[PDB]
Sequence to fold (616 residues):
Amino acid sequence: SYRKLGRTSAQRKAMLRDLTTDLIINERIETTETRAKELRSVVEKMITLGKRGDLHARRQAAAYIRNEVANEENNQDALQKLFSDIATRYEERQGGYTRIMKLGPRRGDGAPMAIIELV
Amino acid sequence: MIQQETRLKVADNSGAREVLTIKVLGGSGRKTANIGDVIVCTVKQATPGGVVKKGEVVKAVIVRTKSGARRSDGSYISFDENACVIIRDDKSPRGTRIFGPVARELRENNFMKIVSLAPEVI
Amino acid sequence: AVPFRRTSKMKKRLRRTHFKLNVPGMTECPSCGEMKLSHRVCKACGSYNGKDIN
Amino acid sequence: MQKLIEDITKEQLRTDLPAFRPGDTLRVHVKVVEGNRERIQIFEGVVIKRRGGGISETFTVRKISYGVGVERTFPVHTPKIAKIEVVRYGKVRRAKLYYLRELRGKAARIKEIRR
Amino acid sequence: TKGILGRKIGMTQVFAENGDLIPVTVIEAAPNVVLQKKTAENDGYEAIQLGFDDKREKLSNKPEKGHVAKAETAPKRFVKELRGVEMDAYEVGQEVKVEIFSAGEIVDVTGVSKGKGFQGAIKRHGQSRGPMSHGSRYHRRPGSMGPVDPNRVFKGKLLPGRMGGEQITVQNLEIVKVDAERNLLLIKGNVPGAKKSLITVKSAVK
RNA sequence: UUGGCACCUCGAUGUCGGCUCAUCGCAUCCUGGGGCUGUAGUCGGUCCCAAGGGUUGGGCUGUUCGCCCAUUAAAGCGGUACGCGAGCUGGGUUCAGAACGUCGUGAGACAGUUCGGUCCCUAUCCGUCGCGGGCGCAGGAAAUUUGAGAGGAGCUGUCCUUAGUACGAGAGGACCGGGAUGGACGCACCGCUGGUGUACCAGUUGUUCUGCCAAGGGCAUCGCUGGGUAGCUAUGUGCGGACGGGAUAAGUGCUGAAAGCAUCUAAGCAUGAAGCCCCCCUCAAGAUGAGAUUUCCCAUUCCGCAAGGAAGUAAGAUCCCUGAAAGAUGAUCAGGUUGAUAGGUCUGAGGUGGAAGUGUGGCGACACAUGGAGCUGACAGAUACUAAUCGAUCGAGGACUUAACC
Fold:
């Protein structure tokens, strides 16, 4: 199957509803290794909606993506920035939109960290 | 897929209305019985006009069930009520008519008087 | 669930064979020269494979 | 893998059968052998189910005759099916009609949709 | 007294000239080349060794090269061996296609059966369990271990472990149809082994 | 077993009966072989060789036993702390509570009866099931095996034919020998019937949230209900215990003395069983007796006088990392940029079913077209898009004696 990551059925989808929206706003994230590998196979489903960019293509991410603030002095939401500027950036690449940059151990957990860029 | 201690809707006007099983006449111990096997049964209810009445150890033949019947075609026959037709401990029935459809996997053995009395041999 | 006898000073110290821990996969940082962990970021360099990533 | 699967048994994809909507009344001409003679009987009824994949798509037809519901599956691509005819099409919002196995008598009709 | 080997893919359902539907595996055996003909005069027994896969450059070792290159055809990944064949029919390097077999003969099938991992003493040995109610805190456990006085457990009582993975053979099977133009064997029955795992296909002792 | 004796155990050895896993003996219940028979035939009785396999499901009883119902080819007996309570149950006796009969003025008793009554533990060692790390195996490494040696499997009924035949007065009804088909358990699997499928899709309720409608999101056990692909599954599907050989057991024999005959004997032979050893299958060279072949790498640089030592490598392997056909973690296993190993990607397969939006019919609930659409978790197929970077250690220099040839 796939991975579960300590959460129940409900909580892991409520986990990844923050690890995409905070990933689109703050543009880089330090999670663990295994939380990275459950975003490399998820976030790349959300960015391809920005390639489609139509009406019903819009109303799928709005079911998923939170309503937080992405750009002050612009009032640009995390939904809007996925389609305004990200859609301009990736008109040519076919798949493969997140890097995995492995850090060292977390201190108290022994957790093998990671860093994800939007490449 | 009829076990011990199941209750069966009876398909002839030979006297009985509902019949419960004892043992499938297979080997030492057989669990189920799909179609065409022969059960020793008893009679939990009968019609008031009854040749065979309440509380009689009877020997009977499964006709139609909620089980499959894997033909070599791959076609699976599956009815919507478990049933019997009471026989006279032979390859021959003892009732007059046979209510409802009868599965065609009785012709594998020679129960052809049940076949000849069937109204729709499905 | 009771140890019937105390463990002597042999069968204790034969259980600490496979309780040892090794040195991990440790290479050299290609830019700032120090020892690097394999397939992770040399935190002294801040680099990985070509780039001191901010 | 799966391309190599069907490219063997594309020669047995029997294309004589009219592709129909799962859930509609329908008759089937089944060739059988009774007494070393080849006859054809006709099995009317509504389709509960179309499922499967490739050569192994099995469907079924339910007939409610003499008050005992008869369900009778068939894989689609058999040589032991002669002729399949759509008598009335049907509309069902669902796709597999398992609830028809209980309801009888006019809470179980499917309305003809004019095609 | 024969045999080739191939790679399992998965089940199908194939018609055979009737309404008779047959469970059918899809065994693909790209044409095997004999890598060594072992003789009884030096190796002490009469056998032969096949080979099956198209190895790449980086996959091979140098001792896998020099074993092949005497009868230089190709480095092949899987190497197995068949005791008891006609040695007088073959030479070192001969290509063996599917042309041996027909669609009507008794055929033996060995293999490498699937895995179930660490799963224990009901699924691993078929044993029953204690009752699921009437206050019993006993179910899914491997039974009593033995009587008192012999002070040990007998070697032959069964216990939880790692089900599957072992080599398992199914005797007296049969080939449905031979399609040698894509190197395909279709065998009547369910053959052990997961997807892409390797199977010897003999002719059984009837 | 009912019992004797009081030897171990009263600084505790928990006791009957079922459930769980079975193992062992043979005085055998079936199955194999036979001998005699008051053995016509079919059933039978009875001893003999046989322990390889099997030994049903229930109502009553706390039940063991036994009766009984219904089958079966058969419903075997007996151990093993009246096997198994650091595996399970607590109905049973054997704690106080309660009551009945009887005993005793009485408190109270009763192997007479009834109702209710806390079953604890985290595994050191030996013992098993499974996996691995090290060194061994006079050089290092790569794959395949011979097989010492072990284990599993080793049950069978109905029906057809010979043949209604020999036999019998009939009634009845065959051995011997062919073919077909099942039950019982056993290995394997997911195409088919269904089962589960909590990061799949569709509907629908209460209520909150994204400013509102629309459309959604959360929570309500996956909120519930109908489906559900891969995956693991059984009742589903395949095949399985085959055909035989070798030597015997009881028998059945010849031949033939001792002991002019007789005699299955002492010599000399042949038969003869589901038994026994191989044949079938799995495991297996740590089988320290360490086997056998196939190729690769080769005899390098330093001490030391040698003996010996370390220190870079070969062949190959490891750390590591993307991985699941494998998966407790190790292992196995597909790969690591001369690459399709994982994820995305664009196609398809299967599922679900007619997306929102728009337009129109309708007072609206709602339909209808757009449109086999829309969405899709593990599936297979292409694509270098995305990381498997660079590195790094480990790892042979091959003894002595004799023979053999050279």
In short: The radius of gyration of chain A is 15 Å.
